[PDB]
């Protein structure tokens, strides 16, 4: 803040729900709680400028968990390569992918 009054008085008006890994009602973790909790602990105390380079590994992983750009890309490529094979006629999905599995339990 610009007037760290909350920090001075030791209270917390809005500091305790700043990010995903904050406390949630009934102890329900947020999506990507593990990754964010890692990134915030990596970049703690070293400052913003150091953290932008020295916690790039933690951040790029959190960014991938949150937005899943690579995951959608990867699953787009698998499905699009399978589309091509099936049009040619060199691949027929398994029974458990065509709606005929033996369900578990």
């Amino acid at each position: 803040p610009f007037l760290d009054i909350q920090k001075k008085l030791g209270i917390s008006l809005d500091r305790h729900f700043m990010f995903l890994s904050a406390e949630q009602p009934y102890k329900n973790a947020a999506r990507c709680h593990a990754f964010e909790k890692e990134w915030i602990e990596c970049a703690h105390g070293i400052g913003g400028t150091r953290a932008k380079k020295e916690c790039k590994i933690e951040f790029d992983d959190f960014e991938e968990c949150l937005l899943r750009y690579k995951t959608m890309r990867r699953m787009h490529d698998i499905k699009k390569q399978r589309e091509k094979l099936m049009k040619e006629g060199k691949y027929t999905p398994p029974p458990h992918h065509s709606g005929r599995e033996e369900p578990r339990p």
Partner: protein
């Protein structure tokens, strides 16, 4: 308005910026911007005539539209990072949209056309509030994210504001417009130095506030809106000419007045970063401010414009204004250059 309304409305006006300034979360910063927007509106339109209603309307639609854009930035950022604060990793376009919206809220040119008109339609004391206290909230947000701001956007806005404020003020006979364009030009200086040294933006804001406050108080003494109205001060409150003149030269950045310090230190720090071209144009167009401030000084303290018969009654009467704050702010805003090293740092 009855005392309950004033207590509620004036508390809310004060509350807004304090919420924006003390808040870690961005949504609570936005909330404070809403409190200021909502509570000022009844103050602006209190006299209820065709001009204050237009002023309170132009202000509302401008500041509400800017609010929605700021909120979009706060929300696109929560989508990108799952957090309620801007990070080094925040998308670049998210930051720029915040900058343009906040400048729209400050009145920085080219998003400035609303400010001179709104200041024109409202009473003097609400122009004081609007041109001073109401600037701290948007600025306190900007100072919290200065490592992130794109300097090219900031300098184009500052150069524009210094030029438009100079050219706009040069054509004005209405004092309230001269104060709005004065504000636009000074915000250019605060903003130009923001991404480099935010402390100098606070120095330039504070010195501007203590110069702009007594100037309004001086016009509120006789309720003088024009250059011809203020020209009668020699026959109404001649004791005021000594400090009106210095404050106007001080607002103009002339040495050895306190108002030279902000421009001089901003230029010095801009050239520590090799911002030579921008700094030179800024200082060269600040000269135009001094011209139409000089023209005002010509009309008030260095000449005696014709006066009217009815002003003799005005002299028989006794005034209870100004208060002890005018004198304190007049001296500090003009005779404090020898304390410069204690103000910058």
């Amino acid at each position: 308005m009855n005392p309950i309304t004033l207590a509620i409305i004036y508390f809310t006006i004060f509350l807004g910026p304090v919420i924006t300034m003390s808040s870690t979360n961005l949504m609570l910063m936005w909330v404070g911007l809403e409190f200021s927007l909502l509570a000022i509106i009844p103050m602006l339109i209190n006299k209820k005539n065709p001009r204050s209603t237009e002023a309170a309307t132009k202000y509302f639609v401008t500041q509400a539209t800017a609010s929605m854009i700021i909120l979009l930035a706060i929300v696109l950022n929560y989508k990108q990072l799952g957090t309620w604060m801007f990070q080094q990793q925040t998308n670049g376009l998210i930051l720029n949209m915040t900058l343009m919206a906040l400048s729209m809220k400050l009145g920085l040119a080219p998003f400035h056309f609303w400010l001179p008109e709104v200041t024109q339609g409202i009473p003097l004391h609400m122009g004081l509030i609007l041109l001073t206290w109401q600037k701290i909230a948007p600025l306190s947000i900007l100072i919290q994210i200065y490592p992130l701001l794109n300097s090219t956007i900031i300098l184009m806005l500052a150069i524009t504001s210094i030029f438009m404020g100079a050219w706009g003020g040069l054509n004005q006979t209405q004092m309230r417009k001269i104060m709005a364009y004065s504000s636009i030009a000074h915000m250019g200086w605060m903003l130009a130095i923001l991404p480099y040294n935010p402390s100098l933006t606070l120095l330039n804001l504070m010195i501007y506030i203590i110069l702009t406050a007594p100037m309004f108080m001086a016009l509120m003494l006789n309720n003088s809106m024009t250059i011809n109205s203020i020209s009668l001060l020699w026959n109404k409150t001649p004791a005021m000419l000594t400090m009106i003149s210095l404050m106007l030269l001080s607002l103009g950045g002339l040495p050895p007045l306190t108002g030279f310090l902000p421009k001089w230190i901003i230029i010095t720090e801009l050239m520590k970063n090799n911002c030579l071209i921008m700094a030179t144009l800024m200082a060269m167009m600040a000269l135009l401010n001094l011209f139409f401030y000089t023209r005002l000084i010509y009309s008030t303290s260095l000449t005696m414009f014709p006066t009217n018969n009815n002003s003799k009654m005005m002299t028989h009467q006794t005034k209870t204004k100004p208060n002890l704050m005018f004198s304190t702010l007049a001296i500090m805003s003009t005779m404090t250059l020898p304390l410069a090293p204690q103000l910058i740092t």
